Design a protein around this ligand. Structure first.
Ligand code: GTP
Ligand code: MG
Length: 167
């Protein structure tokens, strides 16, 4: 299988994204993550291979960082999620990626997820240009999503799946 972790500050929607990827309904059973939670899903990649995604959904709360840190190692893909209205959550992305890289040398693809795009654009606290510029400087990709819109979750996992299939 392919180890994928979701990291990012508390409340950005990591668990909502994972539940949407796993289940085809409205999401409703979500509380803050403490210990990392595991799920697996087998998917057909564009090259026709079946890939098993081994997914760990980790805690964003600051007091639980010493749990989340124990899940970095041996990750092949990472989704780093932030909330477009939560400026601190965006500033935190740099440090999430920095910390992952201190602890893990195996990641092949880091995808920054700008989440909660359903919120009115005039309430966003980060611009598309800032997001693109950040990623251009930090050897990572970006995508825009809303946990409540399955089309955006299918898309962001599709990008991750395509990259895993290149390994
Ligand atoms: N408007 C909006 N709210 C969202 C979206 N995704 C998640 N939320 C809400 O944000 C809150 C936090 O979502 P979670 O999925 O628990 O966030 P998390 O990143 O897993 O948080 P931690 O486990 O504490 O790190 C919930 O009330 C969600 O319903 C989204 O795309 N748009
Ligand atoms: Mg969570």
């Amino acid at each position: 299988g392919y180890k994928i972790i979701l990291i990012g500050s508390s409340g950005v929607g990591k668990s909502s994204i994972v539940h949407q990827f796993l289940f085809n309904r409205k999401i409703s059973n979500v509380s803050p993550t403490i210990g990392a939670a595991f799920a697996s899903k087998q998917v057909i990649a564009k090259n026709g291979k079946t890939l098993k995604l081994n997914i760990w959904d980790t805690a964003g709360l600051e007091r639980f960082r010493s749990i989340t840190k124990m899940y970095y190692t041996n990750s092949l893909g990472c989704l780093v999620v932030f909330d477009v209205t939560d400026r601190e959550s965006f500033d935190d992305v740099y440090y999430w990626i920095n910390d992952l890289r201190i602890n893990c040398h195996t990641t092949y693809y880091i995808l920054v997820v700008a989440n909660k795009i359903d919120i009115d654009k005039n309430n966003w606290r980060v611009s598309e240009n800032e997001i693109k510029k950040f990623c251009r400087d930090n050897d990572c990709d970006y995508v825009f999503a809303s946990s409540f819109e399955s089309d955006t979750v299918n898309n962001l996992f599709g990008k991750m799946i395509d990259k895993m299939s290149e390994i």
